[PDB]
Structure formats: C-alpha cells, structure tokens
Write an enzyme that holds these catalytic residues in place. Structure first.
Site, PDB file in Angstrom:
ATOM      1  N   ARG A 106      -6.822  14.152   5.741  1.00  0.00           N
ATOM      2  CA  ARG A 106      -5.709  13.201   5.272  1.00  0.00           C
ATOM      3  C   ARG A 106      -5.650  12.185   6.146  1.00  0.00           C
ATOM      4  O   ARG A 106      -5.100  10.943   6.212  1.00  0.00           O
ATOM      5  CB  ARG A 106      -4.521  13.952   5.078  1.00  0.00           C
ATOM      6  N   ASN A 107      -5.994  12.259   7.435  1.00  0.00           N
ATOM      7  CA  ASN A 107      -6.211  11.487   8.663  1.00  0.00           C
ATOM      8  C   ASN A 107      -7.091  10.720   8.907  1.00  0.00           C
ATOM      9  O   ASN A 107      -7.485   9.973   9.862  1.00  0.00           O
ATOM     10  CB  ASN A 107      -5.500  11.960   9.862  1.00  0.00           C
ATOM     11  N   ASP A 131      -4.807   7.117  11.772  1.00  0.00           N
ATOM     12  CA  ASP A 131      -3.731   7.716  12.455  1.00  0.00           C
ATOM     13  C   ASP A 131      -3.664   8.857  13.367  1.00  0.00           C
ATOM     14  O   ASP A 131      -4.461   9.778  13.067  1.00  0.00           O
ATOM     15  CB  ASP A 131      -2.400   7.831  11.540  1.00  0.00           C
ATOM     16  N   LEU A 140       0.756  -1.318  -0.215  1.00  0.00           N
ATOM     17  CA  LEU A 140       0.132   0.032   0.000  1.00  0.00           C
ATOM     18  C   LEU A 140       0.725   1.094  -0.004  1.00  0.00           C
ATOM     19  O   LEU A 140       0.565   2.242  -0.536  1.00  0.00           O
ATOM     20  CB  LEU A 140      -0.780  -0.019   1.294  1.00  0.00           C
ATOM     21  N   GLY A 141       2.033   1.254   0.665  1.00  0.00           N
ATOM     22  CA  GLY A 141       2.985   2.202   0.756  1.00  0.00           C
ATOM     23  C   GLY A 141       4.057   2.140   1.783  1.00  0.00           C
ATOM     24  O   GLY A 141       4.068   1.005   2.525  1.00  0.00           O
ATOM     25  N   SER A 142       4.932   3.080   1.968  1.00  0.00           N
ATOM     26  CA  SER A 142       5.865   2.853   3.119  1.00  0.00           C
ATOM     27  C   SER A 142       5.916   4.520   3.676  1.00  0.00           C
ATOM     28  O   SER A 142       7.258   4.842   3.649  1.00  0.00           O
ATOM     29  CB  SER A 142       7.172   2.727   2.386  1.00  0.00           C
ATOM     30  N   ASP A 192      -4.361  15.672  15.619  1.00  0.00           N
ATOM     31  CA  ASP A 192      -4.159  15.795  14.154  1.00  0.00           C
ATOM     32  C   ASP A 192      -5.474  15.530  13.318  1.00  0.00           C
ATOM     33  O   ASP A 192      -5.428  14.951  12.398  1.00  0.00           O
ATOM     34  CB  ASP A 192      -3.171  14.978  13.728  1.00  0.00           C
ATOM     35  N   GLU A 229       6.937  -0.372   6.263  1.00  0.00           N
ATOM     36  CA  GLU A 229       5.705  -0.493   5.295  1.00  0.00           C
ATOM     37  C   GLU A 229       4.185  -0.839   5.492  1.00  0.00           C
ATOM     38  O   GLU A 229       4.050  -1.483   6.502  1.00  0.00           O
ATOM     39  CB  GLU A 229       6.265  -1.566   4.059  1.00  0.00           C
ATOM     40  N   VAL A 230       3.415  -0.415   4.537  1.00  0.00           N
ATOM     41  CA  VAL A 230       2.009  -0.983   4.936  1.00  0.00           C
ATOM     42  C   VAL A 230       1.652  -1.816   3.994  1.00  0.00           C
ATOM     43  O   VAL A 230       1.727  -1.596   2.590  1.00  0.00           O
ATOM     44  CB  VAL A 230       1.228   0.276   5.150  1.00  0.00           C
ATOM     45  N   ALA A 275       5.339   5.466   7.243  1.00  0.00           N
ATOM     46  CA  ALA A 275       4.837   5.424   8.508  1.00  0.00           C
ATOM     47  C   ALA A 275       6.323   4.925   9.392  1.00  0.00           C
ATOM     48  O   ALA A 275       7.056   6.038   9.883  1.00  0.00           O
ATOM     49  CB  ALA A 275       3.636   4.678   8.915  1.00  0.00           C
ATOM     50  N   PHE A 276       6.491   3.694   9.634  1.00  0.00           N
ATOM     51  CA  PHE A 276       7.820   3.133  10.528  1.00  0.00           C
ATOM     52  C   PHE A 276       8.477   2.178   9.322  1.00  0.00           C
ATOM     53  O   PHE A 276       9.596   2.452   9.278  1.00  0.00           O
ATOM     54  CB  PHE A 276       7.011   2.270  11.485  1.00  0.00           C
ATOM     55  N   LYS A 294       0.833  -2.763   9.158  1.00  0.00           N
ATOM     56  CA  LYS A 294       1.624  -1.936   9.590  1.00  0.00           C
ATOM     57  C   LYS A 294       2.818  -2.707   9.879  1.00  0.00           C
ATOM     58  O   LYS A 294       2.754  -3.416  11.066  1.00  0.00           O
ATOM     59  CB  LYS A 294       1.128  -1.112  10.727  1.00  0.00           C
TER      60      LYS A 294
HETATM   61  C1  LIG Z   1      -5.683   2.962  -1.109  1.00  0.00           C
HETATM   62  C2  LIG Z   1      -5.060   3.101   0.384  1.00  0.00           C
HETATM   63  C3  LIG Z   1      -5.920   2.246   0.978  1.00  0.00           C
HETATM   64  C4  LIG Z   1      -5.363   1.947   2.502  1.00  0.00           C
HETATM   65  N1  LIG Z   1      -5.886   1.371   3.688  1.00  0.00           N
HETATM   66  C5  LIG Z   1      -5.662   1.134   4.802  1.00  0.00           C
HETATM   67  N2  LIG Z   1      -6.579   0.844   5.628  1.00  0.00           N
HETATM   68  C6  LIG Z   1      -6.037   0.589   7.095  1.00  0.00           C
HETATM   69  C7  LIG Z   1      -4.667   0.879   7.131  1.00  0.00           C
HETATM   70  S1  LIG Z   1      -4.204   1.673   5.557  1.00  0.00           S
HETATM   71  N3  LIG Z   1      -4.348   2.622   2.829  1.00  0.00           N
HETATM   72  C8  LIG Z   1      -3.550   3.315   1.649  1.00  0.00           C
HETATM   73  N4  LIG Z   1      -2.031   3.328   2.067  1.00  0.00           N
HETATM   74  C9  LIG Z   1      -1.523   4.613   1.137  1.00  0.00           C
HETATM   75  C10 LIG Z   1      -0.345   5.062   1.848  1.00  0.00           C
HETATM   76  C11 LIG Z   1       0.016   3.854   2.823  1.00  0.00           C
HETATM   77  C12 LIG Z   1      -1.291   3.345   3.112  1.00  0.00           C
HETATM   78  C13 LIG Z   1      -1.981   3.950   4.482  1.00  0.00           C
HETATM   79  C14 LIG Z   1      -2.616   5.176   4.669  1.00  0.00           C
HETATM   80  C15 LIG Z   1      -2.879   4.948   6.241  1.00  0.00           C
HETATM   81  C16 LIG Z   1      -3.747   5.924   6.951  1.00  0.00           C
HETATM   82  N5  LIG Z   1      -4.216   6.808   6.368  1.00  0.00           N
HETATM   83  C17 LIG Z   1      -5.048   7.855   6.845  1.00  0.00           C
HETATM   84  C18 LIG Z   1      -5.119   7.775   8.229  1.00  0.00           C
HETATM   85  N6  LIG Z   1      -4.563   6.822   8.790  1.00  0.00           N
HETATM   86  C19 LIG Z   1      -3.644   5.800   8.308  1.00  0.00           C
HETATM   87  C20 LIG Z   1      -3.428   4.670   9.332  1.00  0.00           C
HETATM   88  N7  LIG Z   1      -2.313   4.124   6.699  1.00  0.00           N
HETATM   89  O1  LIG Z   1      -1.596   3.416   5.683  1.00  0.00           O
HETATM   90  N8  LIG Z   1      -3.923   3.344   0.537  1.00  0.00           N
END
Ligand SMILES: Cc1cc(Nc2nccs2)nc(N2CCC[C@H]2c2cc(-c3nccnc3C)no2)n1
Length: 271
Positions: free
Chosen positions: A147-148, A166, A15-17, A143, A22-23, A19-20, A44
């Site tokens: 975005r959060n 978050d 999903l991404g990287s 916060d 990767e996700v 935070a700490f 996470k």
């Molecule tokens: C299209 C999608 C779905 C999704 N779904 C998720 N569901 C649960 C945690 S992440 N995440 C993502 N991401 C993109 C960046 C990495 C990952 C992400 C976003 C968040 C996050 N955002 C706002 C508020 N809080 C949090 C924890 N955490 O990881 N892109």
C-alpha cells in the site's frame, strides 16, 4: 528545500484527500529546469487555515523528502511553503498504489493473472534497490508495505517502475522486536520487505488472513511465519524466510537481498 513558484503550477483533478489536506494531479512548468516544459505532477496540499502544529509536520515531511534522489524512491520535485495552501510537488505515479495494482492483476480476468512471475520478480528488484539506497542513507522507513508503494503505469503492458512512497499500528508488517519492544531498525524494515514480497508473490493477499492483530503478535513472537505463496519459486521463499529470522542480526542486509534477487533473476532468465 526546492522552493517553487505556485504560478508555474496548475491543479487539474483530485486524486484524494487522505494525508494532510488533498492530493491533486496537475502540471508544473520548468520544474525540471527552465526549458524542460510542462510535466505531470502530484500535489500534496496543506489546507488553508491549518494550525502551526500541522505546518511544522508538513515542513518536516518536505525536509525528509528532499533527501531522496533514487529511481525507486518517490521524488519531491518542488515545494510551495511561503503561502497558503502549502504544496509539496511530487513526480506523478499514474498507476496508483502497488497493492491495488497487484489485486487488480489477480482479480480482473479468468485466463490468468495480468502479471507474470518475471513481472513480479522485477517489482521486488525495484523495491530492493530503493531499500539499498535507504540503508545507505541510514533511513528507517517504518512502514514498508505494498500500500506504501506506487506504480508508474495503470495498464499491464507498458514498461513499469515501482517506487517506495509515503514514509512512516500496521501489526502484520512489524517485526517481533517492534511489536514488543518498540525497536525500529533497518533490520526490522528487512522483516517488512519480506512481508511486502509475500504480498507481491500472492498478487495482493492480506498477510495472516485467518488471524487478527492480537493473534498475529502472539503467533509471530512465538516463531510462526506466513505460509508460502502458491507455486512460489524456492529461492524466493528462501530469501523470504531469511527476512523473517527471529533475531535481527541473522536477517540479511538490503544489499544482500538485492544481490540474491538479482542472482535469482539471472538463474531464472537463463532457464
Ligand atoms: C491513481 C492514483 C495515483 C496517484 N499518484 C500519485 N503520485 C504521486 C503521489 S500520489 N495517487 C493516487 N491517490 C489516491 C489516494 C490519494 C492519492 C495518493 C496516494 C499516495 C501514495 N500512495 C502510496 C504511497 N505513497 C503515497 C504518497 N499519495 O497520494 N491515486
């Protein structure tokens, strides 16, 4: 702390990287109970070879997330902290962050926005219910911003739920007392909630657009507020201004904000 075996967890895509480590989007078996089956999850991770200082911070994050059980708060389903890499397993919000979801609804088509006023009001109700839970827990987010927050769906036609993600400089979201005195209360979160509903009602506009971080602190400390969103309903603008009262004591509670949003929702639906 909900200890979960990493053997029952499968990582499928990144999903991404941001935070700490990767996700990951993955699947977990029996995370909602032995016979519950395979469910989609967000993971996470904490990179293998992380410092003790980073491990303690990850542990802190897991302890904070273990305290939240509400439909509008991101839920931690399990944790894998005995071995490396460490995992924090979360419910998957397939629609991503609320800011992107709002911006895409405005900027995708010519016909009009892909989210109506009633769809937007329900986003506000969802967030305000999450804030009532936090106020009841005596937890100060620090916060609250679009975005959060996370959305359960990526499309614009399916039933959706927004959750506060978050937990917490973001100057445009900070109340005046936090900017000058570093005071962070549930009443400063109320200020941020008004900024977040302005973001929702404008379909993702950046607050104080002509101004900069230094201009914002000067403007807000001296009594200046955001311009009203285009065609914004009066009762929503009334609540938004209440949230930005100069004195934290004059700002309404989250329980009052939820009621006012619910009363506007009924007043709107009866028309
Ligand atoms: C299209 C999608 C779905 C999704 N779904 C998720 N569901 C649960 C945690 S992440 N995440 C993502 N991401 C993109 C960046 C990495 C990952 C992400 C976003 C968040 C996050 N955002 C706002 C508020 N809080 C949090 C924890 N955490 O990881 N892109």
């Amino acid at each position: 702390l909900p200890a979960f075996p990493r053997e029952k967890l499968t990582l499928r895509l990144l999903l991404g990287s941001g935070a700490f480590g990767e996700v990951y989007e993955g699947t977990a078996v029996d995370i909602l109970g032995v016979g519950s089956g395979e469910i989609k999850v967000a993971v996470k991770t904490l990179k293998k070879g992380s410092t003790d200082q980073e491990k303690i911070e990850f542990l802190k994050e897991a302890h904070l997330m273990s305290k939240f059980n509400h439909p509008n708060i991101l839920k931690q389903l399990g944790v894998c902290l005995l071995n490396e890499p460490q995992y924090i397993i979360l419910e998957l919000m397939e629609g991503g962050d609320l800011l992107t979801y709002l911006r895409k609804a405005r900027m995708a088509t010519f016909y009009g926005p892909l989210l109506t006023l009633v769809d937007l009001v329900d986003l506000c109700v969802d967030i305000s219910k999450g804030c009532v839970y936090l106020e009841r827990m005596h937890f100060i987010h620090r916060d609250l911003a679009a975005r959060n927050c996370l959305v359960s769906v990526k499309d614009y036609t399916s039933p959706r739920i927004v959750k506060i993600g978050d937990f917490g400089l973001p100057v445009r979201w900070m109340a005046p007392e936090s900017l000058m005195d570093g005071i962070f209360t549930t009443q400063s979160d109320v200020w941020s909630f008004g900024i977040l509903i302005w973001e929702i009602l404008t379909l993702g506009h950046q607050p104080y657009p002509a101004h900069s971080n230094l201009d914002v602190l000067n403007y807000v400390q001296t009594g200046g507020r955001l311009e009203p969103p285009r065609n914004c309903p009066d009762d929503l603008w009334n609540l938004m201004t209440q949230c930005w009262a100069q004195e934290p004591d004059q700002r309404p509670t989250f329980h009052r904000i939820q009621d006012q949003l619910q009363l506007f929702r009924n007043f709107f639906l009866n028309s």
